[PDB]
Write a protein that binds this ligand. Structure first.
Ligand SMILES: C=C1/C(=C\C=C2/CCC[C@]3(C)[C@@H]([C@H](C)CCCC(C)(C)O)CC[C@@H]23)C[C@@H](O)[C@H](OCC2(C#N)CC2)[C@@H]1O
Length: 254
């Protein structure tokens, strides 16, 4: 019963590697922000019309996401085993998980003090309204907040945070993949590491059940990924939208 096997040198290495990768791609100071198109916040205490009409926050948020995408790609390119897939299976995994990972790593800036994401600087504080001004409806934004709170109350160790993202990326069930068995093998190595860290390092532990809760989020993420895709498609229907985006955002979601 309740065996708690010690972490293997290889498993330790993997975490070290993943931890380090994340430090090199996540900026907790948010210093690069002034290099994005400026936030514009029109008063819209509504309007789906004002919103689409203006799209005042889109250029800034499209810039952030785009920037983050780049940081997510850099992270993927440091997952052990990720180099060993055909670059074709790499892009497929990347594109189809890019938004899921962003929602995970944004939790580092999400604050349960006012249910927002703070990257600033009141300028770089993002509340529900700030995402509607970017042309989004409550069907995605409201479930997203709950996801972040559900995620916060897991009280994840940074070690578990980086592994969750690593697993999210290297999923063998994504549409378009060629070598599902190889991708599957890497995920098991990553998932096994997670279950083992939980057993060894997490207090009490009377609840290694934490693992079941973490896999559940990855399923929330699929819903959100699909919902986002719906809403993106509406934005692209809006004329002049393309310039408010970036060629990366356009490629990934189009
Ligand atoms: C992306 C991140 C941040 C916020 C993410 C947010 C806050 C605004 C609300 C966002 C942007 C959602 C919407 C759906 C994004 C929509 C994007 C378009 C309009 C293109 O579809 C999804 C993710 C949400 C900010 C911050 O928490 C993180 O980025 C910070 C920096 C990085 N990397 C670390 C410096 C994280 O990577």
């Amino acid at each position: 019963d309740s065996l708690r096997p010690k972490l293997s040198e290889e498993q330790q290495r993997i975490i070290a590697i993943l931890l380090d990768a994340h430090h090199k791609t996540y900026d907790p100071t948010y210093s690069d922000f002034c290099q994005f198109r400026p936030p514009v916040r029109v008063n819209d205490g509504g309007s789906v019309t004002l919103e689409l009409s203006q799209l005042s926050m889109l250029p800034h948020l499209a810039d952030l996401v785009s920037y983050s995408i780049q940081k997510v790609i850099g992270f993927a390119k440091m997952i052990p085993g990720f180099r060993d897939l055909t670059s074709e299976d790499q892009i497929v995994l990347l594109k189809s998980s890019a938004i899921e990972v962003i929602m995970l790593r944004s939790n580092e800036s999400f604050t349960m003090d006012d249910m927002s994401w703070t990257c600033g600087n009141q300028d770089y504080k993002y509340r529900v309204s700030d995402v509607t001004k970017a042309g989004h409806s409550l069907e995605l934004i409201e479930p997203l907040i709950k996801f972040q709170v559900g995620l916060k109350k897991l009280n994840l160790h940074e070690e578990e945070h980086v592994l969750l993202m690593a697993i999210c990326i290297v999923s063998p069930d994504r549409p378009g993949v060629q070598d599902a068995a190889l991708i599957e093998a890497i995920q098991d190595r990553l998932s096994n590491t997670l279950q083992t860290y939980i057993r060894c390092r997490h207090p009490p532990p009377g609840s290694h059940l934490l693992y079941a809760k973490m896999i559940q989020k990855l399923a929330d993420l699929r819903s959100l990924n699909e919902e986002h895709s719906k809403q993106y498609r509406c934005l692209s229907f809006q004329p002049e939208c393309s310039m408010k985006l970036t060629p990366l955002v356009l490629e990934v979601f189009g």
